Amino acid sequence: KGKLPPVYPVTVPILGHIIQFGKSPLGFMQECKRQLKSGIFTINIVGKRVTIVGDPHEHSRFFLPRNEVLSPREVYSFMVPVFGEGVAYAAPYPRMREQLNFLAEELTIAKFQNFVPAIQHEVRKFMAANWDKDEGEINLLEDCSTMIINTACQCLFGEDLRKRLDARRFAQLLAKMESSLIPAAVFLPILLKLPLPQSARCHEARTELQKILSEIIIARKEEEVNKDSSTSDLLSGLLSAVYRDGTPMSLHEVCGMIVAAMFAGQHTSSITTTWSMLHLMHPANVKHLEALRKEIEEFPAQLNYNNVMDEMPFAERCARESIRRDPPLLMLMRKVMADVKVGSYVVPKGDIIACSPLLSHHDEEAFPEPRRWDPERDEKVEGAFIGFGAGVHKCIGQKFGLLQVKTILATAFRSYDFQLLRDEVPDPDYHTMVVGPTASQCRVKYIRRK
Amino acid sequence: KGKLPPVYPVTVPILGHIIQFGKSPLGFMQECKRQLKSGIFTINIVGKRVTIVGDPHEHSRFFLPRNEVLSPREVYSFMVPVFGEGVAYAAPYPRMREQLNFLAEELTIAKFQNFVPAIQHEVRKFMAANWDKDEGEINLLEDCSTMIINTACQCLFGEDLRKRLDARRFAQLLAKMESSLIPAAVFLPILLKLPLPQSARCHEARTELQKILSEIIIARKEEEVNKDSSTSDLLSGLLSAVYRDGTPMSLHEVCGMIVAAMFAGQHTSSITTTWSMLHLMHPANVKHLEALRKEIEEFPAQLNYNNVMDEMPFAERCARESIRRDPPLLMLMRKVMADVKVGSYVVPKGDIIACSPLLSHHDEEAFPEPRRWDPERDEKVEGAFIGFGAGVHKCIGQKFGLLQVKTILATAFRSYDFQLLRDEVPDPDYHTMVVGPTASQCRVKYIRRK
Amino acid sequence: KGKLPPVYPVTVPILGHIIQFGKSPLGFMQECKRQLKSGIFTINIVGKRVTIVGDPHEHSRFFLPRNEVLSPREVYSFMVPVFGEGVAYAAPYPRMREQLNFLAEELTIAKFQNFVPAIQHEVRKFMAANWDKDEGEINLLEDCSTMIINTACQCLFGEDLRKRLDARRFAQLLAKMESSLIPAAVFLPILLKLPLPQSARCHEARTELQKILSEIIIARKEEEVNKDSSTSDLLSGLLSAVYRDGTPMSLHEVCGMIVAAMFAGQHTSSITTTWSMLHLMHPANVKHLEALRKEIEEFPAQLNYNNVMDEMPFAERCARESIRRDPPLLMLMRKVMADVKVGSYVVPKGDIIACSPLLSHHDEEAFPEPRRWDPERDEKVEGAFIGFGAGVHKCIGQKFGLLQVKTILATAFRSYDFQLLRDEVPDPDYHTMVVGPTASQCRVKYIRRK
Amino acid sequence: KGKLPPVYPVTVPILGHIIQFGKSPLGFMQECKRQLKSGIFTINIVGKRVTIVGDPHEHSRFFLPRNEVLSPREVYSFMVPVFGEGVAYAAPYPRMREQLNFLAEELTIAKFQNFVPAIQHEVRKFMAANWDKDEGEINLLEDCSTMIINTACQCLFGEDLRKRLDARRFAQLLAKMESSLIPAAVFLPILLKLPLPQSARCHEARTELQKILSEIIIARKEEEVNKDSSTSDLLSGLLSAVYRDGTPMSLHEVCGMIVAAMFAGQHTSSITTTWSMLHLMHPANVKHLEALRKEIEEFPAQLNYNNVMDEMPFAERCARESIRRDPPLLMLMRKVMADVKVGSYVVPKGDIIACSPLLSHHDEEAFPEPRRWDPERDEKVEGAFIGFGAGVHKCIGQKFGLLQVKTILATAFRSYDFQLLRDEVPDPDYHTMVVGPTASQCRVKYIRRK
Ligand code: HEM
Ligand code: HEM
Ligand code: HEM
Ligand code: HEM
Ligand SMILES: CO[C@](c1ccc(Cl)cc1)(c1ccc2c(c1)c(-c1c(F)cccc1F)cc(=O)n2C)c1cncn1C
Ligand SMILES: CO[C@](c1ccc(Cl)cc1)(c1ccc2c(c1)c(-c1c(F)cccc1F)cc(=O)n2C)c1cncn1C
C-alpha cells in the first residue's frame, strides 16, 4: 500500500534486539515473523533499522536491484583495512566489477583440469600423515579446515610461493587480519573513524603479505627469462590483468584480491565439507552414504575433472543441502540508497536491508521439515536457496568451493569410514562470523577401509 | 579560581579531539596548553570530558588521591575479559589491593637471587641460536620482545609449567586475548555490552590458559603427596595466598593475576630494552656506550644479584631515560568519583581525569631539550618522571622490568656490538596501545666481539 | 490620516483605563483592538496618552527609531534607585551604550565553552540535593528560579564573591531592591521625589551590595600582585572597562550593571524554563516531549558547548514559543520626543508609545490559535515575535538566558519525567512585574527514570 | 485675626514642606512654631494643607471630638490591605468600635496573670541562649526586637499556633506586609486604587497568614472533639466574639485584628525597651540605674502580675520618659469632616489636622530641657504627654506594651550590666515609619553579673 514494514517491539532501549538475535538468531527471527504476521519486518540493532526480507517469494527484491539502489559498500566497509583502499566494494562499482571479473577468470573450468589432481594430491598427503592408523580419533572441523587451506594453496599458488608462504604462515597472517575486524562497525559506523589497535595489526599483516608477494614476483623474474621460470598461477594471472582504461592491476590490488579469495573460501568451504561428512556418517543417513559410495564406486584412483565436475551430482546435493540446513553466512545486507517497494511495503532510503539465508532456508513452505538434512530435497519456492547469494552479488567462487568439497568427499569416503562420537549431529555454533558446527562437538573416529 | 578547568573548543561535531590527538599526541596536548595558557585543561574524546593534568607540579593531585575519589576501575573496564570478573580493578578495592599485594610479593627483590642467572641462561641461549655469526641482520624490537617473554617465563614459572606451556604457546594465547581488546570502549562503553567475535576468542583463550593451569595444579598436588620435588614459582606463590578474610585465592583469580603480570611487562620491558640499545649503539651516544662498557667491565661471565642490582646504576639510568623520552604508556586515566581540587581548579565528579607521561616528560622546565636522550640527566621538577606512574597505583613490576632490561643490556653488549642502519634513532610509533619505536625501522646488524 | 490613532473611550475620568488593564491586560487590549477596528490605538493611563502599536506589521516604527526620537529614559525612571544615577538609561545615551556594550562583552558565546558544563554541574547539584527520591512533589517555579540564580552566579561571579554573597543572600538583597519599585511612577512622576519607605530600603540594599563588591575588590588587590589574582569574572571584567573618553567604570556603575544583569535574567529565565517544562510534561504535548527526547537522545552525560549551542534547535523552539505564548514582559514603552509616523497615523510628540509582546503574540494573523503552545509554529508575520524586544534596544542577554534554559531542559528531561497536578497548564499571573505561571498552580511531581 | 491658622510659606511648589519635614521633623516644626508665633499652624504636604496642633493646652481639641467630626479613616486608609477590607477604621465607626473593644477585651488585667510568666519565660530563654558568656557584643535594637516578638507570641498565642506559626515565620509574613505600605497614600489617595506590585505582595502575605490561622482553627476544633483540651488565647478569644447585631467575627476580621495587634506593638515596644536600656546604661544616668536596681532587687526570681503592674513605678517612668523624649510615632492625624474651633482659630473641613507627640513633647513649658532624659520629670502642662495618644483613640495596647517593656527591663538589669559602645545615646533615626534609635549605633556589651 505505502506503509513501512511492521517493527518488532523494542524493550531494551539502547541495544534493541541485538541481544535476542545473538542468542538465537533463527528463533528470534521466526518469532518476529510470526508475531508481526509478515515475512518482511524491521528490527533494531544498536539504534539502526534493519529490514529483513524474510519471505522467499520476495528474494529477488533484495538480490536483483542495481548497486545505485541497494549498495553493499557501506555494509562491507569494516573490511576496508583487509581488502585495501580501492579494492572490491571500496572501489567505484565499474572498477570493482572489473576486479571481481579478473578473480572469476582465475577460477574458470579450464583451470579446474589441473585443480582436481592438485586437490586430491594434498588430501591424500594429509590423510597419509594424520589418518594413518587402522582407526583413530580426530577433530573433523579442524582437519577439514587444514585440508581446505592446503588444497586451496596447492590450486592457486605455485610451488615457489608455497615454499616462502606455506599454508601455515599464510593462515597466521590471515588470522591476524581477521582478528582485527569489527563487524559491529556496520551498526556503529563511528568505529571506522576511531584509532584502534586493530588497524595497526591489520595493516601490519597485510603489508607483510604484500612484501612476500613482492619478493616472490622478483624471485620469479630471476627464474623467469631463463625459461627456468614459467610459473602460472593466481598471482601471475592477476598480475597479467589489464583494466578497460588500459592500466594494470597494482600489486596493492592483487594482494587485496588474493586476501579476498582466501577469506571467502577458508571457513565456508571447510564448514561445508565438515557438515557434509558429519551428516553422511550419521546412521540415519546410511542411504545417502550408500548413494555417494555408488556415485564414486567406479572412479579411478586419480580423479579427473570429468569425475568431479560432471559425475558427482549427488555429492553436489550433499554439499548444497548442508549449506541449506546450516548456511555459514547467516545474514546478507545492503544499504538502501533510495526507497524500494518490497511486497506491500516501502523500505525507506537509509535503512539497512537484509536477507537471511538462515531464516529463508527454514521457511516451511520452501523447505518442509527444515532441520532434516535431506540431499534429495529441492526448494519448493523458486530461488528460496540463497546459501551462495544470488543476482548482482552472487558468489563467484561457488564452483571452486564445491570442487574442493566434492574432491575431499570422494577421497575421504573412498578410503575411510567415520563414526560420530555423539548420538546427534553437532549443534551449529552461532557465536562466530562464519557459522559452522560447534568445534568441541566435532570429534570423530576414522576407520581405514580394507 | 575554584571553577572548572579551561575547555578546549571542539570543532569536530561528534568525535571531539580524538583525531587531532591521533595525528600528533604531544603536539596537540602542547598546543592546547599553550593556547589556553594553562597546564590543566579539558579536552573532549567522543563526547567525554577528559581533564588533563599537564602541569608537572600538579602530579600529586592525580596520583595521590584515594580510590574512592579517583578510580581507574571504569577506565580499565575494557580489560575485564582478560583479567576476568572481580579481578584487579573489577573487584572491590580492599580486595583489589589484596590481589595486587600478592602479585607484588612475587616480584620482590628477595626473589631476584635466582632470577639473574635464569635470565642470563635464556638470553645467551637466544643469542647462541639466533646471533651465531660474526655479523648478521636482525629486527632488534622483535628480538628483545622474544628475549623478554623467554626470560620472564624462565623466572616466573617452574619447569613443569614450562613443559605444557612454553613461551611460544603462551605468547600465542596472550596474543589471542590481546587482539580482542578495545581501549576505545572507555569512551564508547556500549562496546562492552555487545556480543562480538572478539569476546568469544578472548573467553576461549582465557579458558584454555585456565585449563592448562588447573592440570598443572592437580599434577603438582599429587606430585607433592609423593614428594619427588618442590616447585617454587609465581604460580605456587599465588596459590599459597590467603585473604585477610581467611579464604584462599580462587583459581579464576590466580589465572587473572598471571595474565595481568604477563600483559604488564611484555611490551613495556621489551620496548625499554629496545630503545635503550637503539640509543646506545647510535654514534651521537658513543660516550654513553663507553660508560656502560666501563660499568660492566670487570663483571663475571656468570652474573649474580649484586652486579645487576647494585653495580649497574648507569645501565639503570639508560633504561629510565629511554622511558623518560618515549614512555610506552602515553596517558594514564581515572574516573573522577567526587569533585577534586587540581591546581587552582575543581575537576567535577563524572569527568575523566588524565595525567600524561608523554606530555609531562616533555615539559621544558622539567626536562630541557626533551627530545635529547641523556641518561646522566636529572628531573628539575620534583616528581616529573612518571614512566612507572606514582602513588596509589604505582607500577609494582618496575624493579622486575628493570632487572630484565639491565641483565639483557649487560649480557648483550658484553658479547656484541651493534650498528644502526639509519642515520637517526627510530621514530616512536603512536599507533599501538603500548608505544615503542617503529618496528620496521628497528633493523640492526649485530657485530660479535672477540 | 496623518491624524491621531483612534482613541479608546475613557469612562473612569482620572484613572483612565488602568483598572481595566490590570484586571485582564490581554482581554482588555484585544477588546480595544476589535472595537476600534485598529491595531494602532490609544488608551489612557492616569491621564497620560499611551499609544499602542498593536499591529505587528508596524513593529519597526517602535523598535527602530533612535533614542533621540523614541526615548526609554523617562519610562525606566522608576528603576534609577536600582541601577544608580548615571547608569544605563539614566546616563547620556552614548555613555549608556558604552555601559551596555561592556556588559555584552561579558556575555559572549566564547565564554559559553566553559559556561555550559559550569551550568550543568550546578543544575545536577541541585537535582541531586533536592530531587533525590524516585518520585516526589515540588513547586517547579521555585525550583527553576533557584537553579537560575545558582547557575548565573556560578558563571558570572568568582568563588570569592560567591562565598561572601551566596545565592540565598544575593536573592534576599535583590528582593529587597525589587519590592521597593513602583512602575506606576512613570505615570505619577512625583513618586520619584518623595522619601518613601521603599526608597530607603532600596538604598540600603544597593549600598550593602556595593559594600560587598568593594570588600571583594580590595581583597583581590591586597592579594593581587602575582598572576595569582587571576580571579576573572563579571566583576573584574567590568572593572577593567575604560570608556572612550579614557575614564574607567566606577564601582558605582559596576554595581549598577551587575544589579541590572541579575534583575534582567532572574525571573525571565526561570519563568521561561518553568513554562517550557510545564508545556513539555503536559500529556497533550507528548509529541513535543518525544521530539525533545530524540534531539537529546545521543548527548553525553556531560553536555558540552556544541550539544547546547549547535544541537538543540528544537529545545530552543520550546523556550521561544513559551515566551511567545506568555511573554514575561507584557509591555514595552518609549517617550515620544518628536512626532512619529505609525501606520496610517501620527503619534504626537509627548505621548508614550508602547509595544506589547502580550498583545502582538496573540495577533491571530501572526500567531493563529495563539493560546495553543506550538513549538513547531513559525511566525507568519515578519518581526512578529518580540519577546526579547527588537531594534535599538534588543535584549543583550538573550543567548545567555536561553543557554541556561536549554541546559536545564536537556538535564531535566534526560533524568526525569514530570506530572503536572492539574488538567490545564497554569494560568499566567498578571499581577507581578515580571509575569510567570501562577506560582500556586506550579506544583508538580518529578519521577526518576531508570 | 483668628480665622485660619497662620500658613507657613511654600517656596518649593509641588512638594511643599514634605522634604524639609522629612529631613528634620522636630527642627522644621519648631521653626514653624517660632516663625509664625503660634502653636497652631498649617504646612503643605504635596499640595495638601495639614494643620498641626503644636500647642499642648489645645490637645483635647484634637483627641476628644467624635469620629464623625475628626475621622481617622482616610488617614489610616493606606493600611486597609494589611488590616483587610471592612476592618478597624475601614468598618463603619460603631462597628469599628466593637471590633476594637473585642481586641481590648483580650488585653485586660485578667489576661495579664498569664502574660507576666509567659514574658519572663521568653526573656530568660533568649538571654540564656544569646547572652550566655561572662560578656559579649550584641545589637540591642535587634535583640530587644527579637525578645518583643517572642514574648508577644508567647502571651497571645497557644503553643499549638506557635508551632505552626513561630516567631521567625510570623515576622517574615509581617515584614512582607509592612514593606508594601506607602504612608504617602494619605496625600496621594490615587495610590490605593492602583494595582501596584506592593498591593499584590501584601495580599499574598495576608492570605497565607489567614490560611495558617484557618489550619490552626481546624486542628483546634479537632482537639475539642478529643476534648483533650480547650486551648485558650487571643485567637480563641477573638473567635468567640459576637457583635451587637448577633453575628460572630469572620475569620477575615479575626486575622485583621491579629495583624493589627502585632503591627501595633512590634516596633513601638521594641524601641521603647531599647531606648530605656540605652539611657539606663549610659554613665550620666547611674542614679536612675541605681533607683531601678533598688526597685527590682526586692523581687523573687519569678516575677508576677503584682510585681510588674503595681510595684514598678520607676521602671514605668523610665519607659514613659523614653517615649516622651523620642516618641516612636511622630505624628497623629485626622481628616476634618466639619469646621472645628482650635484655640482661637477654626480649622476648615477638608484639611488634615495633626497633633505631633514629637512637637508637643518638646514644648519647653510642658517639658523643660526636653532633650534631657529624666524619668523623675512630670509633665508641667496637663495632658501634654501624648506618646500613647488620648481621648477617643487612646492606645488600647498601652498596658500590654509596658508590661513587656518592664518585664524585660527587670529581667535584664537583674542579671546583667551593659556598656554602650559609644560616647552618647544613639541619635533617633527619623527615616523609618516607626521611629527608634539608629540601629547601627545600638551595639552594646552585655556583662553578666555572675
Ligand atoms: C562454500 C563456500 C562459499 C560460500 C558458502 C559462499 C557464500 C557467498 C555468499 C552468500 C555470497 C553473497 C554475499 C552477499 O550477497 O552480500 C558470496 C559472494 C561472493 N563470493 Fe562466496 N562463498 C563461498 C566461496 C567463495 C570462494 C572460494 C570465493 C573466491 C575464491 C568466493 C568469492 C566471492 C565473491 C568475490 C563474492 C562477491 C560477489 C559480488 O559482489 O559480485 N566465495 N559468497
Ligand atoms: C618497563 C616496564 C613497565 C612499565 C614502563 C610500566 C608502567 C606502568 C605504569 C605507567 C603504571 C601506572 C598505571 C596507572 O597509573 O594507571 C603501571 C602500573 C602497574 N604495573 Fe607496570 N609497568 C612495567 C612493568 C610491569 C611489570 C613487569 C609488571 C608485573 C609483572 C607490572 C605491573 C603493574 C601493576 C599490577 C600496576 C597497577 C598497580 C596498581 O594499580 O596499584 N608492570 N605500570
Ligand atoms: C528570558 C530571558 C529574557 C527576556 C525574556 C528578556 C527580555 C527583554 C526585552 C523584552 C527587552 C526589551 C526591553 C525594551 O525594549 O524596553 C530586553 C532588553 C534588555 N535585556 Fe533582556 N531579557 C532576558 C534576559 C536578559 C539577561 C540575562 C540580560 C543580561 C544579563 C538581559 C539584558 C538586557 C538588557 C541590558 C536590555 C536593554 C538593551 C538595550 O537597551 O540596548 N536580558 N530584554
Ligand atoms: C510602646 C508601644 C505603643 C505605643 C507607643 C503606641 C502608641 C499609640 C498611639 C500614639 C496611638 C494613637 C494613634 C492616633 O491617635 O492616631 C495608639 C492607638 C492604638 N493602639 Fe497603640 N501603641 C503601642 C502599643 C500598642 C499595642 C501593643 C497594641 C495592641 C497590641 C496597640 C493597639 C492600639 C490600637 C488598636 C489603637 C487605636 C485605638 C482606637 O482607634 O480606638 N498599641 N497607640
Ligand atoms: C570476505 O569474504 C566474503 C566476501 C565479501 C565480499 C567480497 Cl568482494 C569478497 C568476499 C564475505 C561475504 C559476506 C560476509 C563475510 C565475508 C563475512 C566475513 C567477514 F566479515 C570477515 C571474515 C570472514 C567473513 F566471512 C561476514 C558476513 O556477515 N558476510 C555476509 C565472502 C565471499 N564469499 C564467501 N565469503 C565469506
Ligand atoms: C532590569 O531588567 C530589564 C532591564 C531593562 C533595562 C536595562 Cl538597561 C536592563 C535591564 C527590564 C526591562 C524591561 C522591564 C523591566 C526590566 C521591568 C522590571 C522591573 F522594573 C523590576 C524588576 C524586574 C523587571 F523586569 C519591568 C518592566 O515593565 N519592563 C518593561 C530586563 C532586560 N531584560 C530582561 N529584563 C527584566
Automatic annotation (TrEMBL), chains A, B, C, D:
The keyword Iron applies. Pfam families: p450 (PF00067). Heme binds at C395. Keywords: Heme, Iron, Metal-binding, Monooxygenase, Oxidoreductase. GO terms for molecular function: heme binding; iron ion binding; oxidoreductase activity; sterol 14-demethylase activity. Gene3D superfamilies: Cytochrome P450. One of its GO terms (cellular component) is nuclear envelope. Heme b binds at Y76, Y89, R97, R334, H393, C395. The keyword Iron applies. InterPro entries: CYP450_sterol_14alpha_dmase, Cyt_P450, Cyt_P450_CS, Cyt_P450_E_grp-IV, Cyt_P450_sf. Its EC number is 1.14.13.70. PROSITE patterns: CYTOCHROME_P450 (PS00086). It is an enzyme of class 1 (oxidoreductase). Its cofactor is heme. Belongs to the cytochrome P450 family. This is Lanosterol 14-alpha-demethylase.
